């Protein structure tokens, strides 16, 4: 916890930013439920609403996760 938290800061790993992005998703949910009066019906309409606003957020988080795991393993990258 001591040494590697220094590496985060030293290397400018946007670690706190990722965490805060989660918290913003948590917040978006909380604010949305209180405003709506209740949402289970329709759940899919809210799923459509979000994807429309953030069409590639989930996709790109998966992309970067895979790339971070690959980097951490030291895998050799090629283009095409």
């Amino acid at each position, epitope marked *: 916890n001591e040494a590697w938290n220094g590496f985060v800061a030293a290397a400018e790993l946007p670690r706190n930013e990722a965490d805060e992005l989660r918290k913003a998703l948590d917040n978006l949910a909380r604010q949305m439920i209180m405003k709506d009066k209740n949402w289970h019906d329709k759940g899919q309409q809210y799923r459509n609403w979000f994807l429309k606003e953030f069409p590639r957020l989930k996709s790109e988080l998966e992309d970067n*996760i895979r790339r971070l*795991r690959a980097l951490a393993d030291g*895998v*050799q990258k*090629v283009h095409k």
Partner: antibody
Amino acid sequence: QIQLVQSGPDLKKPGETVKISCRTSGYAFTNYGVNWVKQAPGKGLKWMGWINTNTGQTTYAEEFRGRFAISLETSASTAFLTISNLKNEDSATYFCARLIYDGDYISSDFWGQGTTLTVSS
Amino acid sequence: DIQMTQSPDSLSASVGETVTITCGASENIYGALNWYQRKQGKSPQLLIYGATNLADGMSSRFSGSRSGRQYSLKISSLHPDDVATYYCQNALSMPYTFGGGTNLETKR
């Protein structure tokens, strides 16, 4: 054409050492990784480990930490699997395969023909 | 380490039928999943990478799909030369663990 050609089948006694060669051709050897896979009798495939053909970093599955060593002869575009202190359960067919990472996905895209090792007295 | 649970252990189908084989990852692997085909006495060959991408040179009859932690390999129209053992593989982080394999046979 891309090719990985492995050394031939071998019979070894328990305790001995074997070196399995994987001679590659048809691509930039130091741009792709090499990993090794153990084929047990039946269906089983066990991923063994990987070597970085540029840096020389290796990574092994837990099961293969002790007696297994992956090495290189870059000038010959060749990778080696050396197994020391051969034990009874080392009898298997071993595969080398190129490891490609295209920036998104990681896979063994080209494979050697395999090397069948028998450990017996 | 990530466990890959493959199902079924074996199955058989008639030429022209569609086949589905599935693979469960012990945790989310975010699409980092390969399928391999291993014909008897032959080296495994890459079939699918990135869960859904057809390896170059392989038949379009093969396709991959994903639902959460569940990955599926589909053959749309079984051919006799599809007889093989099929393996999923965790390709997210090392070790790149293989599933136990699914044997596919043909009925005739």
